[PDB]
């Protein structure tokens, strides 16, 4: 509520009024690492502050305790704080021990001012009502859901705070019931941080092709589990592409172009073979069931039907005969309807410059996600491991630059290897039937397997989780159920547990489903004495000990908040 979209520009002006000083650094941007959206958002923010000369300190943070450690050691000279990708769910005054009495300067007249501004760039739609309403210091960059949906909770909270027998109980318990109905609600995303920051850049006037491409990457990175967000934000990106494109031509070494062209829903089409692109795609294995041998037979049969030889299909896309790849849209239109792959046809954004080849938005965001993942006494191991993924995040930041395409090709190769590992472990799960039905949720526990040291990473376990949700979503015989995905780390000796939401099949076209695992995780942590970690910014990511795993799952299946 404190910043609607039409005054994002005003908020940026306030940042200048606290940070446009050549002598000292006064702006520190806390970025949630291990998120593509926050990475692109901070890249656009860093370009904007570089063009206007604002001093900055970009700090990547993994855990909530890491946030508290970094905020506790901050100097008092810093007056502007930007929280990218997080800070929209928890109460920041109750977490960062913030009291407004020692941070207030020049209160005199009903005006209040503070010596530090903390801005929140968060996409998680459960918004803390104290944080968004009763807080002057914590300033939210709201998408606009407060003006449409959160009005009843606004008046309930305001008459709760204003009024500190049957009338008092009858109104106060009703407003607290409304507030507790808004609370204990699942977590969802309907807007991207990159779209909000590009709206800020449109309000200022610093938009160009690079910021538009970063906005395209940030919007495209949410297409895996939040396809309604991408389908909503696609026409604005189409309007911006057709606005900032030039008039027209011959391929020349300096002309960067960014076209809206058919970019099919495939894993790494332009940097791998067509056989490996269909074989490692989540949607193709989701529909044709490629995990068993019959699916591979059907894939070879449709290669026979499409007229593409397996010698030509297994050849690299750049070296592929273009009698196959020029009329590939016509072949896709004629042949994919019989096998159910009609939804492969999809228009996306493809950027190229010079003579170095074309890259799509989807291939670029899988390359960036791979560079986040495997880009490079137990508490020291956790600290070193958190430092390792912070180094991975900065390597992926280095890959965002135009002059560092070798990092991009390294990310492409890492994405290929990681998708091979994900495919092997996915068919490992599916062949031996470790998926167990618990009547309210589906349980998948990895005890041992091939290269299990990749799954101490969060996004690799989320990649396996989205693989399983896509593979099980097209099977209509089992209905929509939430998924618990646990992976064991022997050296740390902890089960890292991820909560995965189900989704409808991609061909259908409604209300998005929520993430009800954080409420149960918090309630079990409060009621039981489980030594667990809640510090991840995605609240469905927890770490349990091995010996406390089965009581945690029994208390999870006893609880009805799934």
């Amino acid at each position: 509520m404190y910043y609607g979209i039409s005054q994002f520009s005003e908020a940026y002006n306030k940042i200048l009024r606290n940070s446009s000083s050549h002598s000292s650094c006064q702006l520190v941007i806390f970025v949630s690492c291990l998120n593509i959206d926050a990475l692109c958002a901070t890249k656009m923010l860093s370009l904007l502050f570089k063009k206007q000369l604002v001093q900055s300190q970009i700090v990547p943070i993994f855990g909530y305790s890491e946030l508290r450690r970094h905020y506790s050691q901050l100097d008092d000279n810093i007056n502007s704080l930007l929280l990218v990708g997080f800070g929209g769910v928890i109460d920041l005054e109750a977490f960062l021990e913030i009291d407004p009495q020692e941070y207030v300067i020049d209160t005199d007249s009903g005006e209040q001012s503070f010596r530090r501004d903390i801005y929140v760039l968060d996409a998680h739609r459960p918004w803390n009502l104290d944080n968004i309403f009763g807080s002057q210091i914590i300033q939210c960059f709201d998408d606009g859901t407060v003006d449409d949906t959160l009005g009843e909770q606004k008046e309930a909270y305001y008459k709760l705070l204003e009024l500190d027998r049957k009338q008092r109980k009858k109104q106060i318990h009703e407003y607290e019931g409304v507030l507790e109905e808004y609370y204990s609600q699942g977590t969802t995303v309907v807007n991207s941080i990159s779209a909000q920051i590009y709206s800020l850049l449109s309000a200022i006037g610093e938009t160009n092709l690079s910021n538009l491409w970063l906005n395209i990457l940030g919007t495209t990175s949410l297409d895996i589990a939040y396809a309604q967000v991408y389908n909503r934000l696609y026409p604005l990106l189409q309007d911006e592409v057709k606005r900032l494109t030039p008039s027209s031509s011959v391929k020349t070494p300096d002309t960067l172009t960014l076209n809206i062209q058919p970019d099919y829903y495939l894993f790494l089409l332009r940097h791998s073979s067509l056989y490996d692109s269909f074989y490692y795609s989540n949607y193709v294995n989701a529909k044709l069931s490629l995990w068993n041998e019959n699916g591979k037979k059907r894939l070879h049969k449709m290669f026979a039907r499409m007229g593409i030889p397996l010698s030509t299909a297994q050849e690299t896309w750049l070296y592929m005969d273009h009698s196959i790849k020029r009329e590939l849209g016509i072949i896709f239109d004629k042949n994919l309807d019989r096998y159910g792959l009609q939804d492969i046809i999809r228009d996306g954004f493809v950027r190229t410059l010079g003579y170095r080849g074309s890259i799509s938005a989807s291939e670029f965001v899988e390359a960036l996600t791979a560079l986040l993942e495997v880009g490079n006494n137990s508490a020291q191991k956790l600290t070193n491991l958190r430092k390792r993924w912070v180094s991975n995040f900065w390597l992926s930041w280095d890959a965002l630059d135009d002059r560092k395409v070798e990092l991009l090709n390294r990310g492409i190769q890492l994405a290929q290897d990681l998708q091979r590992a994900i495919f092997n472990t996915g068919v490992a799960i599916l062949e031996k039937k470790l998926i167990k039905h618990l009547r309210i949720y589906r349980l998948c526990v990895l005890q041992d397997g091939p290269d299990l040291d990749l799954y101490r990473n969060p996004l690799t376990l989320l990649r396996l989780g989205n693989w399983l949700i896509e593979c099980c979503a097209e099977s209509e015989d089992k209905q929509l159920l939430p998924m618990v995905l646990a992976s064991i780390d022997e050296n740390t000796d902890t089960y890292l547990v991820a909560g995965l939401t189900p989704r409808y099949p991609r061909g259908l076209d409604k209300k998005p489903i929520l993430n009800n695992f954080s409420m149960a995780f918090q309630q079990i942590t409060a009621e039981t004495d489980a030594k667990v970690r809640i510090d991840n910014f995605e609240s469905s990511i927890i770490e349990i000990r091995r010996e406390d795993l089965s009581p945690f799952l029994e208390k999870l299946t006893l609880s009805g908040l799934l």
Partner: protein
């Protein structure tokens, strides 16, 4: 000259002290059951035969059927009250001067101790292993 011979049962396990306080008397209970079944099996074998393996072969057929059900019921009680702070005081591990190991599941340690004291038999080691 007595039919009962004024026999007594002596149990002096220091192994029992490395267990949770709820699980300590059940160890003595199952040791008493093991002892009574062993005397009954030895008496039956001696009376049958007299008119490398010892007299004790096949003694665990007498009480494995209650013991499997008791272990499963104890496991069901284990998966409820270990993390509950009301009953966690019965589930703690004691600190003793000889202790060097760390327990991970108290019922696993109890089952290992019972199967190890039953595993000392040199004759019926196959059946105890099963």
């Amino acid at each position: 000259e007595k039919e009962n011979q004024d026999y007594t049962a002596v149990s002096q396990w220091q192994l029992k002290k490395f267990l949770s306080p709820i699980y300590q008397p059940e160890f003595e209970d199952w040791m008493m059951i093991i002892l009574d079944s062993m005397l009954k099996t030895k008496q039956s074998y001696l009376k049958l035969n007299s008119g490398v393996e010892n007299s004790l072969n096949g003694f665990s057929h007498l009480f494995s059927k209650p013991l499997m059900k008791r272990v499963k019921k104890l496991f069901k009680n284990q998966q409820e009250f270990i993390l509950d702070p009301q009953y966690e005081a019965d589930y703690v591990i004691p600190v003793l001067p000889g202790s060097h190991l760390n327990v991970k599941n108290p019922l696993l340690e109890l089952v290992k101790s019972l199967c190890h004291v039953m595993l000392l038999s040199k004759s019926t080691i196959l059946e105890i292993r099963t």
